[PDB]
Amino acid sequence: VEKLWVTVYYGVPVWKEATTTLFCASDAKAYDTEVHNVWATHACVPTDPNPQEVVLENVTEHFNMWKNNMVEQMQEDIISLWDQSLKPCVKLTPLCVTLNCKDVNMERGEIKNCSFNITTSIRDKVQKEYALFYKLDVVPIDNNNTSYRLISCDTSVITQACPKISFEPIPIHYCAPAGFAILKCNDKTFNGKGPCKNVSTVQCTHGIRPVVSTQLLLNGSLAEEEVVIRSDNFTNNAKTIIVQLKESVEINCTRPNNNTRKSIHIGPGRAFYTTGEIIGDIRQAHCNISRAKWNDTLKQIVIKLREQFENKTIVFNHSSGGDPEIVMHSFNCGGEFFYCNSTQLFNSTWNNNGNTITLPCRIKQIINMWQEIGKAMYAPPIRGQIRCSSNITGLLLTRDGCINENGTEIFRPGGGDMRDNWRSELYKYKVVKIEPLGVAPTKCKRRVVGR
């Protein structure tokens, strides 16, 4: 060569694995119509009409869904919005009065009719008011007299989420900041951890609907080729097995009761809403799904489950234990929070050598998402009846780590932690930091042979 010299370059194609505060993109038809309050969606920017992406040739980046901070960022965000949105809403702290509950006419007394005295907007009226509660939302005292108390009144701070707001899962994109970049795995069947092949750069992700369920994965994205199973390590029986369906199985659900709103004003400028009465028959909440579709879907799963395991026969089972949240398929349907008993969907043994399913559901109103510090939320009742339809897009399993002769290997509905809800979608992506400055030798001196 020649007298070679360092020469410096600004604008080189170089990045490093990184983490930094992302920001969100909204949707055009979402912002325009008011929908009143909805999460913190209003405070976002709007997503670009042109869904711009650039494919990266001759690159094979490494992705590992499990160690991905976008999900440690996602739930961080998701909790922050809720707390702040419920910051101004009505506090139910004085409603800790002794509830004199008679029952109404799965017949143990799920709906209960209770009375109690409260002071109104004004301190000169102790009004004996009567209201309705769910058997779960309430808890008795001493001997089972006619007396109950709210489920977590003594130990928590219950806050009535304002009815003006909505829990509708508006999709969301995580737009990356400047000098940074978010990469995508454009493969069909990606393991979750490992090297990628079809990689590309985007500004924001695809629309991530922040739905929160506890057992099945609803309204998410389907697999592209064939259903896939994803775990950190499968021997790690303390590790959630995420499944992603190819074909989404539609699941219809409903609270059949036509309810009436009743504003009891604790005041001064605020009231506590409850069901005044039930217009018509009294019925049970449930969720309908084709058992053909569901178990033919279970056929998809087992064959790809047998890939990670030995061809040994597989068995499914109901959850070993935990809060109603985990042990039951919990989700929001039209503003009310469900808890479907999923023994039916998970009770089967799949080896080698009609009708439909109706899952019973309980409605809770006093709930504590994210299991907070004596901080509970009372969802006011939604007027009338509600009926919603979700797409199961996948689910979460948990293996029983004590292999048996008969056995053989058991998988029950997981869903203790919430970080996987986001992993299930944010697996495709990763964040990097751009570093445009780079030095390299080429024969050229800094032109100072004369001055």
Binding site: T7, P13, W15, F23, E57, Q203
Partner: protein, 151 residues
Amino acid sequence: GIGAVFLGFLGAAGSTMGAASMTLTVQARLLLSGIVQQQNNLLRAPEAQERMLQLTVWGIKQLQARVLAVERYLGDQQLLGIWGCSGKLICCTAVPWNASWSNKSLDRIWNNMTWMEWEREIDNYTSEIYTLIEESQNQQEKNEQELLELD
């Protein structure tokens, strides 16, 4: 043809160092203003509630990251300044190539390695390299001064 047509952000990530040497503007742009163009443009959508209820949860996520993007960008522009070459993209120095950094030859550097690949192999020395250019300027800055006195 190839150098006078479209490419795209970060397109030459797996292209040779020589190849990438044409598509700098692509990744030399949008380091800043990649987002300030888009933000200002998309944010003036008919909302009229930009920063309503004062600042919020997305309020800081942006500003904590807005204020980063510029100082991060101004850090590389401060290097261009302190190395005496803010012509950007490409700039020669008097600092010679210490083969202790990379014994390898010219032919293969520009036509086989890629920048992602290269900057790794040279990552550890960059600190010492960068400091050599700063002391290359100041030698020149005093040599300039000395001649300002006498003429």
